[PDB]
Design a protein around this ligand. Structure first.
Ligand SMILES: *[C@@H]1O[C@H](CO)[C@@H](O[C@@H]2O[C@H](CO)[C@@H](O)[C@H](O)[C@H]2NC(C)=O)[C@H](O)[C@H]1NC(C)=O
Ligand SMILES: *[C@@H]1O[C@H](CO)[C@@H](O[C@@H]2O[C@H](CO)[C@@H](O)[C@H](O)[C@H]2NC(C)=O)[C@H](O)[C@H]1NC(C)=O
Ligand SMILES: *[C@@H]1O[C@H](CO)[C@@H](O)[C@H](O)[C@H]1NC(C)=O
Lengths: 234, 184, 50
């Protein structure tokens, strides 16, 4: 009550405009603006909370697989391991895809009964450099120590990521390479479809033009005068 | 009728659009100047236009921008004449050479132009274009950020499925299944 | 420092005021007629007193 009472503090004739459309526009704009601003604010907040929430996931993830987690979080293929509570990385060395060779057999003839668990490869760094023996790791990584073995088992049948696709071994024998398209795919993603609001043009529109309004009067005084003042000269 | 300090001319879709935030209006013209020669008895057009623009530039822009070319007159739908004077700030004054030429490339009986009595159409067009631009921008940003997030979490799901292939596959496939890794 | 977060930038739509605008005022429309009948009458009915 006090607050409303604090508003009280020659002659003039107030002039009112003929078009109320400006205040109507202002109302529509203010309404929409308020709503869209509110919702988008809410989105910004919820997203912000979500990121901190998933941090907790990423710490355990990087304990599980520091190479991939660091490779994502740094921006390039690196290697990483934990130095207590902090991570240590180092940039890997790329190798051209035409300079990598999958070996046929996954069983070492020297000691029977022991077959290499992952397919071994042989590659080169420069297109003229020496050859290097290695073994295929996860996600196109070239491992140098062939300590990945396994007791040979009947029923062996494996796919391994190779290049931009896969390689297929049956009974520790090189079957064949196989590109991504020939394996049914499931997705961990959640879709969302956003199409921009298209452009729209507003053409000028009038219910009545001022010429129709001037013609609304049954007798335009001016035209009557001009006609009737020509009688002597006519 | 209307003196306009800040009038932004943006070209798109084969049309010039002169938006004034001040009077909250957006006029639509073709991409070529309207010749003042075709105006039946219209010296006050060029005179009043040049004088008013000299006054505006003198009042507000004389220390920030640079006059780009002689004034240009375009005819906006609804029957409005638009005297106009392009400008270019002190910052990025490097492109005076190109932009002056570009504005000079617009120059090419009698008639009396008829003006509509309702400016509301261009005001609506301005409001719509403003809102449309904003909402489109923000929602685009959302789409992008979401898209990045999915790829980001892929990395989580690979280790997750190594930990518990039955549940991860049960989610990713759509039904209760059993799963295990055949290498990769 | 590396980050696991994904950025997103949302700025509120600023306020905007609509000023009243008229192409022609009704006084200009009343003046559009070449002869306002009322004013002619008021002028011409003052001849005896003038
Ligand atoms: C993503 O955008 C829209 C839905 O918002 C869909 O596009 C329209 O779909 C209709 C049928 O629903 C078609 O007649 C139109 O040709 C599509 N385009 C437009 C501009 O309307 C689109 O299908 C959605 N994406 C998916 C995968 O459904
Ligand atoms: C977040 O908001 C906007 C982008 O939507 C950016 O803010 C403007 O940036 C321009 C240059 O692009 C500056 O001239 C303006 O001063 C900024 N503010 C406004 C109100 O326009 C801002 O840079 C974005 N954030 C980041 C990190 O880029
Ligand atoms: C723009 O050009 C088209 C094609 O010549 C014409 O029909 C239209 O009237 C023009 N609009 C103007 C000059 O405002």
């Amino acid at each position: 009550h006090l607050r409303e009472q604090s508003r009280k503090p020659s002659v003039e004739r107030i002039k009112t405009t003929s078009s109320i459309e400006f205040a109507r526009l202002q109302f529509t704009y203010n309404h929409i603006q308020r709503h869209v601003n509110d919702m988008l604010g809410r989105v910004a907040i919820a997203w912000c909370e979500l990121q901190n929430h998933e941090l907790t996931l990423w710490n355990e993830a990087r304990k599980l697989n520091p190479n991939a987690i660091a490779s994502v979080t740094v921006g390039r293929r690196v290697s990483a391991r934990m130095l207590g509570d902090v991570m240590a990385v180092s940039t890997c060395v790329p190798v051209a895809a035409d300079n990598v060779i999958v070996q046929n057999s996954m069983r070492i003839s020297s000691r029977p009964g022991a077959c290499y668990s992952r397919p071994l490869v042989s590659f080169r760094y420069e297109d003229q450099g020496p050859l290097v023996e290695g073994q295929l790791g996860e996600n196109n990584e070239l491992r140098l120590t062939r300590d990945a073995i396994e007791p040979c088992t009947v029923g062996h049948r494996r796919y391994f990521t190779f290049g931009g696709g896969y390689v297929y071994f049956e009974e520790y024998a090189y079957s064949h390479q196989l590109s991504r398209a020939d394996i049914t795919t499931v997705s961990t993603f959640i879709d969302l479809n956003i199409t921009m609001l298209e452009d729209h043009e507003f053409v000028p529109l009038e219910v009545y033009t001022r010429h129709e309004i001037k013609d609304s009067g049954l007798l335009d005084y001016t035209e009557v005068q001009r006609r009737n003042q020509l009688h002597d000269l006519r | 009728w209307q003196e306009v300090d800040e009038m932004l001319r943006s070209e798109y879709g084969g049309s010039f659009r002169f938006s004034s935030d001040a009077i909250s209006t957006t006029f639509t013209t073709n991409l070529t100047e309207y010749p003042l020669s075709r105006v039946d008895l219209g010296d006050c057009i060029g005179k009043d236009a040049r004088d008013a623009m000299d006054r505006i530039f003198a009042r507000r822009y004389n220390a920030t921008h640079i006059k780009v070319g002689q004034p240009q007159y375009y005819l906006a739908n609804g029957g409005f004449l638009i005297a106009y004077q392009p400008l270019l700030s002190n910052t990025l004054a490097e492109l005076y050479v190109r932009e002056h030429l570009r504005e000079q490339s617009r120059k090419p009986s009698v008639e009396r132009i008829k003006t509509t009595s309702s400016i509301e159409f261009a005001r609506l067009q301005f409001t719509y274009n403003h809102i449309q631009r904003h909402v489109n921008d923000m929602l685009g940003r959302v789409a992008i950020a979401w898209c990045e997030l999915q790829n980001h979490e892929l990395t989580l799901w690979n280790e997750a499925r190594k930990l518990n292939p039955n549940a991860i596959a049960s989610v990713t496939v759509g039904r209760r299944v059993s799963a295990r890794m055949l290498g990769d």
